[PDB]
């Protein structure tokens, strides 16, 4: 401990057994350190040794397909503090795809300040569930330990004791010959020695002497001359949030490695410079810079690799590239966007530039500031440029904004089928590689074949939108040859969005969201166009045309490509209010409710509605009883490509024939109630009569200022509730009693009409006799002013009276007593 070794710059270990004994004399690592793709080395080649000569690294670590590694103590048996200022994957530790390893070497690493832990994509790796992520760093709800085979605790792990401190999983451990340092969870990241407690109290990762701040290898508050004060006092400044160092020392630190350099800023002596500040080497301080400025960036060892989609290597603002670059990003299916995700903020590439699997882009417009290449550092094979897998690239860069020049470097144009050779020669002349006689490896037997770079735009000669169709015609176009034309290809889809793409929705035979129509070549004239065949009213649509033409064996395209237009269909008469229901709410008031129409046709201004009263016929009263790319399937999928191949062969067949003939043939010389409901689904009316039917017209409107346009009418016939009590017998029930068994009865008509009255129930009874019912018809009542009893029995009779209508049913009025005598 106490940093007993020399400070070395960044390094890497790759493909040999001689490079596995380098870090043994380096105690401070300034730069990147990686171990990846060891296939030339074998399992027993590796050796095992423990050395306490490493205490810090100042950059990310990356393990990748290391074949033959049996322990991680061989090269890191003393690493205690890990943090970096330059990120890669945004993580500080990156174990990507390692295998043939069965134990770690970091039972001392418990201080993590910058970056997180990424344990994912790890096959055949044991000891991933015998590590306390709450001990090494913050709790596990902030670390993505997923996508592995140790999420289910595969493998058996033996940890001494089952020395090991108090704690598949039995105890925590990292190696079979060394135990993990474990202490209470509350410490979190403070580290600890094996005492079952945080090392001193507020240290960080580990400390030489427990209970002493002086020995904290790192603590939680900036360390200054033997203390861990909250902030650093002047002239000292912060340092990676674990140290206090002054200006002269902030300088001498980086000057000693002469690596990484630190500069005072924000009271932060850290290895960074704000946006756009280049260095001046008198003190290696951050100095202002204008224009493009690569500021701080690590490029040591004349090269740098990019094997991630996001890192703090090309987003810092390092435009000028002094090193090399190699892209090996794993996964995905488009290196276009993968490349863009790393060099999105850099527009001038002064280093090794290359592109692969070109897709989703047909022209480069992200390298519009590159105008010079230094080439001071030698590139692999002295080549500064390569081209490969460019199968969607249709254009190179402009020559009045780019102005590139090469002072060192070579060109390699291979496997560029879609690009035309004109742009290639442009590269050769603007870059000026051939102009210096430098050797270039060119392969045009694979380039300038099946290419097209002619993108001429066509315009719509005439347009006529309707509310359910759209007519479109475009200027007559003829390629260099009149015969070379197979029609046009109008492509369209509905699009209210002001940002839509054409790649999703086509190029398949099971689904088609971008409907495609074809058009016969024009008369040799006549304007070729297209007319919609019905569309939803009040909708916005994206439309464009692309000319289809016969291609030669040379595979040359004279095509034309019109642009996309946004044409919006017009409105039409509203639809009917969905689910119209008219139901009574009282006897004098009925209500109407509905749902908005099926097809609104733009903004609604009101609802046209009418209503009228329906009465009851008098006859009712006088009656008595006395693969896929988009949702769903297609309806316009395209013809099979083999069919196209054959029709093309037949076309060119007849063509070759025509030419053969031309050759052999020629030889050279020797009123109604109405209501208006403005944007509401309810309706209420009042001033109606008990048990009365009402019919109500109903429509929906969307515009009423220059015309009256509304949905078709609808009708519902409903009747307010009936008043059952309104049928009770009222009116003086007058009796005319005689001694001859004759009693003239007089009861009056029920209070309310209550619609049709079927009859009057006269129940004249006696107590000890049979009950005698009488059905008083309309005629009988109206003619008898009630009723009369023709023949009777002696005794005091009683006649309950209840009129019968059909509004529900009345109640038997008081029994009216009449003492019959004879």
């Amino acid at each position: 401990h106490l940093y007993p070794g020399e400070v070395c710059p960044g390094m890497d270990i790759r493909n040999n057994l001689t490079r596995l004994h380098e870090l043994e004399n380096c105690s401070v690592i300034e730069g990147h350190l990686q171990i990846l793709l060891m296939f030339k080395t074998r399992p027993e080649d590796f050796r095992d040794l423990s050395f306490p000569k490493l205490i810090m690294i100042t950059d990310y670590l990356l393990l990748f397909r290391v074949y033959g590694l049996e322990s991680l103590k061989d090269l890191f048996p003393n690493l205690t503090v890990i943090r970096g200022s330059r990120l890669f994957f945004n993580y500080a530790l990156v174990i990507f795809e390692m295998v043939h390893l069965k134990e770690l070497g970091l039972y001392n690493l418990m201080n993590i300040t910058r970056g997180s832990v990424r344990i994912e994509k790890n096959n055949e790796l044991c000891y991933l569930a015998t590590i306390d992520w709450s001990r090494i760093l913050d709790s596990v709800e902030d670390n993505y330990i997923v996508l592995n085979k140790d999420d289910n605790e595969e493998c058996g792990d033996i940890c001494p004791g089952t020395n090991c401190p108090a704690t598949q999983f039995v105890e925590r451990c990292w190696t079979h010959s060394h135990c993990q340092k474990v202490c209470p969870t509350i410490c979190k990241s403070h580290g600890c020695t094996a005492e079952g407690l945080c090392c001193h109290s507020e240290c960080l990762g580990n400390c030489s002497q427990p209970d002493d701040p002086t020995k904290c290898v790192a603590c939680r508050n900036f360390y200054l001359d033997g203390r861990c004060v909250e902030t650093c006092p002047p002239p000292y400044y912060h340092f990676q949030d674990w140290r206090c160092v002054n200006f002269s020392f902030c300088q001498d630190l980086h000057h000693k490695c002469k690596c990484h350099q630190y500069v005072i800023h924000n009271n932060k002596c850290i290895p960074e410079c704000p946006s756009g500040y280049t260095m001046n080497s008198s003190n290696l301080l951050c100095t202002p810079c204008l224009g493009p400025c690569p500021k701080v960036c690590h490029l040591l060892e004349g090269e740098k690799t990019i094997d991630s989609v996001t890192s703090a290597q090309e987003l810092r603002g390092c435009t000028v590239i002094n090193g090399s670059l190699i892209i090996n990003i794993r996964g995905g299916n488009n290196l276009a966007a993968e490349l863009e995700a790393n060099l999105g903020l850099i527009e001038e590439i002064s280093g090794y530039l290359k592109i692969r699997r070109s897709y989703a882009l047909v022209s480069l417009s992200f390298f519009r500031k590159l105008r010079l290449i230094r080439g001071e550092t030698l590139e692999i094979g002295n080549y500064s440029f390569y081209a490969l897998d460019n199968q969607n690239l249709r254009q190179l860069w402009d020559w009045s904004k780019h102005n590139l020049t090469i002072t060192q470097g070579k060109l390699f144009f291979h496997y560029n089928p879609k690009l035309c050779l004109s742009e290639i020669h442009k590269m050769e002349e603007v870059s000026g590689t051939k102009g210096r006689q430098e050797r270039n490896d060119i392969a045009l037997k694979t380039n300038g074949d099946q290419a097209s770079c002619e993108n001429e735009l066509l315009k719509f000669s005439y347009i006529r939108t309707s509310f359910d169709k759209i007519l479109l015609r475009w200027e007559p176009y003829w390629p260099p040859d009149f015969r070379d034309l197979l029609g046009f290809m109008l492509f369209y889809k509905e699009a209210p969005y002001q940002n839509v793409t054409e790649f999703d929705g086509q190029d398949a035979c099971g689904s088609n969201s971008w409907t495609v129509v074809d058009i016969d070549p024009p008369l040799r004239q006549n304007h070729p166009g297209w007319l919609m065949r019905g569309l939803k009213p009040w909708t916005q649509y994206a439309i464009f045309v692309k000319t289809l033409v016969t291609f030669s064996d040379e595979r040359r395209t004279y095509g034309a490509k019109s642009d996309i237009i946004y044409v919006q269909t017009d409105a039409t008469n509203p639809s009917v209010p969905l689910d119209p229901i008219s139901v009574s709410n009282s006897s004098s008031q009925i209500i109407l409710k509905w749902k908005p129409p099926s097809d609104p046709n733009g903004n609604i201004t009101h609802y046209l509605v009418f209503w009228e009263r329906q009465a009851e016929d008098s006859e009712l009263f006088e009656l008595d009883y006395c693969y896929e790319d988009s949702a769903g399937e297609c309806c316009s999928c395209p013809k099979t490509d083999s069919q196209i191949l054959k029709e093309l062969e037949e076309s060119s067949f007849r063509k070759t024939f025509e030419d053969y003939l031309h050759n052999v043939v020629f030889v050279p010389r020797p009123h109604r109630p109405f209501e208006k409901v403005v944007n509401k689904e309810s309706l209420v009316i009042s001033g109606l009569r008990h048990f009365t039917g009402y019919r109500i017209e109903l429509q929906a409107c969307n515009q009423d200022t220059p015309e009256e346009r509304c949905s078709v009418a609808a009708y519902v016939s409903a009747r307010t509730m009936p008043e059952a009590k309104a049928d009770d017998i009222v009116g003086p029930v007058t009796h005319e009693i005689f001694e001859n068994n004759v009693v003239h009865l007089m009861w009056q008509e029920p209070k309310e009409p209550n619609g049709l009255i079927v009859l009057y129930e006269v129940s004249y009874r006696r107590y000890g006799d049979e009950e005698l019912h009488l059905c008083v018809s309309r005629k009988h009542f109206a003619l008898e002013r009630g009723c009369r009893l023709r023949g009777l029995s002696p005794g005091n009779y009683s006649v309950r009276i209840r009129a019968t209508s059909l509004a529900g049913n009345g109640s038997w009025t008081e029994p009216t007593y009449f003492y019959v005598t004879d």
Binding site: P479, P480, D481, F482, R483, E658, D659, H662, V665, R669
Partner: peptide
Amino acid sequence: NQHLCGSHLVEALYLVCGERGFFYT
């Protein structure tokens, strides 16, 4: 106008020759 070929070549040549018989030997 497009390239003189196919039937267009013949129509363009008939404007020049074809009234005194097509040359063939």
